Design a protein around this ligand. Sequence first.
Ligand code: SF4
Ligand code: SF4
Ligand code: FES
Ligand SMILES: [Mg+2]
Ligand SMILES: [Zn+2]
Lengths: 86, 690, 96, 208, 48, 115, 125, 109
Amino acid sequence: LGLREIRIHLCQRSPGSQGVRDFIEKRYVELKKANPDLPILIRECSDVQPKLWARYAFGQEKNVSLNNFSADQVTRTLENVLSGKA
Amino acid sequence: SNLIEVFVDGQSVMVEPGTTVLQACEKVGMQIPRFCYHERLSVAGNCRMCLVEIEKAPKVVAACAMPVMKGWNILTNSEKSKKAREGVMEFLLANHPLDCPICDQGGECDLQDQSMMFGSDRSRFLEGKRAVEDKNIGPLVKTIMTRCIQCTRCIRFASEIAGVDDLGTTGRGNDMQVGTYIEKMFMSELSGNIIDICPVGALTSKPYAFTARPWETRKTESIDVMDAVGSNIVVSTRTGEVMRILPRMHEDINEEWISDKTRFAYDGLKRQRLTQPMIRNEKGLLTYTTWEDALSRVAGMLQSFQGNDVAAIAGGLVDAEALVALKDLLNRVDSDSLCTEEVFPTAGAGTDLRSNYLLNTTIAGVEEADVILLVGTNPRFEAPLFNARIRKSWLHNDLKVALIGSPVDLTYRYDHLGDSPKILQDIASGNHPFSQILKEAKKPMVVLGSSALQRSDGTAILAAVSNIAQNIRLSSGVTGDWKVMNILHRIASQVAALDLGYKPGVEAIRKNPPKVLFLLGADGGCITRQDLPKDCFIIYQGHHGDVGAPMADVILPGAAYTEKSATYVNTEGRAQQTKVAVTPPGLAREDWKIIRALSEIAGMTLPYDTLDQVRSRLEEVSPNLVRYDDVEGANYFQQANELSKLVNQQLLADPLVPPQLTIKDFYMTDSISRASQTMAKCVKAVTEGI
Amino acid sequence: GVRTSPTGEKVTHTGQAYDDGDYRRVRFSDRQKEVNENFAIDLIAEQPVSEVGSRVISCDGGGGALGHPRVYINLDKETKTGTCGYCGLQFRQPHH
Amino acid sequence: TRPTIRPRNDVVHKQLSAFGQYVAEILPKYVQQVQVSCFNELEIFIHPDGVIPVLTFLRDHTNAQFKSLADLTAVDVPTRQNRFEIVYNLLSLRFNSRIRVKTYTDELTPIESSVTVYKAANWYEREIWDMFGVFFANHPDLRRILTDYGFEGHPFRKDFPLSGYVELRYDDEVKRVVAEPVELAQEFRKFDLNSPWEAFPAYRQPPE
Amino acid sequence: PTTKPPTARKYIWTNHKFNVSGTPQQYVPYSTTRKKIQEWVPPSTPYK
Amino acid sequence: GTSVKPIFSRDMNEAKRRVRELYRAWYREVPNTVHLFQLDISVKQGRDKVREMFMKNAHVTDPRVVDLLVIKGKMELEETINVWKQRTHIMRFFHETEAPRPTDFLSKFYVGHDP
Amino acid sequence: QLIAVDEKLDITTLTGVPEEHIKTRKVRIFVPARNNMQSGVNNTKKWKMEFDTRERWENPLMGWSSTADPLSNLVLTFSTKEDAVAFAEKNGWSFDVEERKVPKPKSKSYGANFSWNKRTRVSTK
Amino acid sequence: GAGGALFVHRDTPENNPDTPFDFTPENYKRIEAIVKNYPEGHKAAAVLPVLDLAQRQNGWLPISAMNKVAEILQVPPMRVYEVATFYTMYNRKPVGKYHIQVCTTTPCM
Ligand code: SF4
Ligand code: SF4
Ligand code: FES
Ligand SMILES: [Mg+2]
Ligand SMILES: [Zn+2]
């Protein structure tokens, strides 16, 4: 339940990360305003695939793929991770 | 095109105008003999070893200074060129001393090799040789001037690369000597490189003297961890012992040079070393122990507490693998108090966006900027190769430099604006004269030292600097991928720790003091036992006995940067990996292996058993830690700038003073250099020249 | 110039001597430790300094072709003698 | 140029070039290259399928009569796709001449045995198999010749370590000689002797 | 050596010795070099 | 066709049949080896050693490699049958003197640096 | 006739190397860096393949340097990087490859030593 | 024959950095006039006359005179040392009141 940190691994120029890129450049700041104490690490992926990591208490973490998503899709999955809804 | 056609031994080559005969010859794999020419120094033309014949020209020309003409045919192996080489080598060897067995340049001499490949085999010199008295220029460079051939490489290096004009020639004719003419110490943070550029044994390394020969050494290519520049180096070992450190050429990081701390602090790896595990006995004294019992003690103490009661502080020479292993181990206990001694502000973006704490322009990009503003730093001692790059751009590209802070000597003239931080705000405001200067510039750069961020108002300083950069970007527009904003780090372990998610600074531990403290090579003295609850279990894991070890309950001996294959991230974000040159002494072990063994003992076994698996974990946490020469990254300056505006912390009316104010403060910064006996000599020589 | 270790072991000219707690001394039980008695540093220190009337002197170690490669020593410093890099013999100009 | 330089012999050079042209003309199917060195040695590079024909020709043709097989051996060059190079040195007593035939193979491609052409090859091929692991097809008795019984690996390969992998000692618990992983009181000290300056400009390679 | 005596040197043995193998005077090899790595010495005073 | 020629076998089936022939020969030879060399092991122990040696190369999929392995095994059997080998050579297959190297992480960490 | 093997080349079972020195070894494929003490570049033409450094200790007698891994001195030379990679793959060794570092072309001008207005004018020769 | 003199400086009570030397005000006017001869931004070109001027005021060239010239013309002291040791008209050791030079080259020989 207790979220500790989240990581967005997005690849810089691959088309599959394009929507994710849009998120980072449109509505990441607002999100950082809403969660001023939650680590949200933005990291650069290789030529393979974009994905999101979520870490919970006692080191348990899970990842979801973000390939060919849109800005709406990525904010939807991010808010699903943030809330107690899957 | 603009290329012109020349011929090397009748082979057509297309070269840009201004190319010399030497560069045209090396464009087809032909290396002209040389003694005085260095591709990173100004042309001298005095040694005359490079004389080559041009077809249909009676006079041989100096290939190192002669631009190629259209239609020229260079004859690198004709009778005239060979005879010129033989005559020049004969003159060079006429007065040279018969010192090869006692010379440290023995198997590494350009004079020897070019005599064997281009000179004659006999001597017809039937006179007495000349002898020159030696000069003392300090404890680092040993001088035997009889072996000097007067190529003036050291003089040009000092004058141009180092910005120190202490070396020269006195006299004329045969009795012309290279020196200072006075008893003067040649102190420079890059003074050791004159040992490497000198083709002969006239300048040699004093700590290295008489210990090894070049053919015995095994060469291990590795990365320097003494600063955040990450200079590429070669550790030369012999029979499992480190003999010396040499520069390894990297055109984008350190070029051909290293720092004096990089070169001469390796002996500190033999002085105060942790070799066996230690625990406290019934009398409260540290005593030797097997690995099993110390690991069991630490695991038993770790199993008792959980959450906020367990904290860890990382030191300045900690690798990425050890950092991620400790992060995982403390996460299994549900702890997040993973901190670094170096402080970086966490307001706004903090460490969330990488570009917030990187040198985004990169080191090679310095040679493209037309103006640079330095805030609250001494780049000469914090990052000597970065300062060398700045000096190189100042010399060749006519770079304009300004500094806000203490008026330190940077070896090049700069416009000093003062040391009051308020000036930063004035520049952002536009009231200041310098603000216009940044506006007219096509490629401005602003560099903020991480040492200025260590003070109380570091967040305010970072906010003001970001305001200045944003004003530049808004006024001049986006020039492209220029990345005006930069941060200059001084800790080799800081950037990797920030990438992995470590909390910068120690304030998290001071807010909630822990019951169990992990000191992963933390020898800065930020946290003592006065700032901790009594009966605190302190665990120190490192390779040196320094200020952090005697205050621990359990000591776990770790490996040094020369004893492991470890990943360190640059101040510009470039990940690099060292290689094992020698194994750790005694019972010392690799750090990530120590953490994994401790995890298995304590019951929360980590999912990695080998180095490849722990680097896979590193990729899982931060993918940039496995790209081992990549330096490209994203520009998220807009988001960080927006998030830095929500905090309006007041600046301090305290002048910016860097921790390193003179050369004496440069030599001892970390545990290795404090344990080094050569740096003690350097400090003593700087304090009293005698 | 042999000296005695606190444990009673002879110290070689290289300065080596096993500590009290070192088990490797057991190899010398019922046998002896081989130490050369003539110390080259002390022997070369006894040689008198040669006075010459020239700024530059030549040294070949004596014996002509039976010595070392011939080298030339500068003697312009008045506060220190010139030392051969092979033989250790010292040379100086008349001072005082 | 007289005293210290080895003198040249152009007559032998011309004769060897003429005979190399002759051999290349007669056997176009297998001959890939012919060379004559500066010290008058004739070399013929052939396809691996021509070992039996070419040698037979060189032994039985009236103009060749290379009746003696002086030496047969292999050379290991790891950078090549065909790792191993098979060299045959032949001597002709009738014409007082020496010739060299070279072919190539890798670790998995067998080479046809030349025992029928030359009896002397029988041991040499065995030695090659022992030292490099090159298999010879249709060999009357192909087995190890130089190494110890049960020796694993081929020592003359470049990737084989100098001291090998195992060492022998007598053990009194089992009362016999045993093999154990190799351990050295003094490790062999590798020396870096190559000069960083070019020695022979005539052999310089294009810089790509 | 009675008619052509050898040269006198101060370091030449004045007393010849035969092969001393198998006697208590036999040569025993050892490493003549000093210790390479020096270990950290913990303080003698208690920390708490 | 990858331009590769066989040694003996053209597909995996012929290589497998040659493997089975060699295995049969070794299985038949084991008791004679035990008797002649005067080994202190059982026939079952030697046959299990033969099975282990055959299974050590069970992952091979190249018929040429299987062919070369069968050829080497034939030479080994010919060495054993003709008493060219000695008791020492035969008993090297068992490593009676070698101390077993531990495989778990903790023991490797305690003893040294090797992975 | 040809049999058309379409498998990956693997000669691991034929080389007789102990399995310890095949699976746990890591090789480095690289062009060696120039010795910074000399300007000659003849030792930076070919590719080298070497093995990871293992433990060396001191002999209890005479203090020599003892080793326990047979691949301590094994260095192989290749003309191209692809040949080294192919050799490593077919021998079953895991490898790490470093790209060649070539010095950038420099712009040298002797006359620049005597500039009328630029910063490159020297103060001594 | 040989040079005889030495091209290194060793400190001495009669020759050291603390040895008192300074230009007379009229010599300062002369230095100003000398410096005015060369283009702006090239002030090292005046080391040859100014240094000579010092030798005219003092009779020889102590290390303090070289340091003073370097400080006045804002050049590194090493460059002034190089100029002083290169040229034979400069006296880095005191000379007599009347300095007698005899030409001994072949036409005079
Ligand atoms: S510098 Fe070179 S040539 Fe001169 S003495 Fe030393 S090794 Fe010999
Ligand atoms: S000391 Fe070395 S680098 Fe300097 S001029 Fe003499 S030979 Fe050249
Ligand atoms: S290299 Fe051209 S003159 Fe020295
Ligand atoms: Mg040198
Ligand atoms: Zn001598």
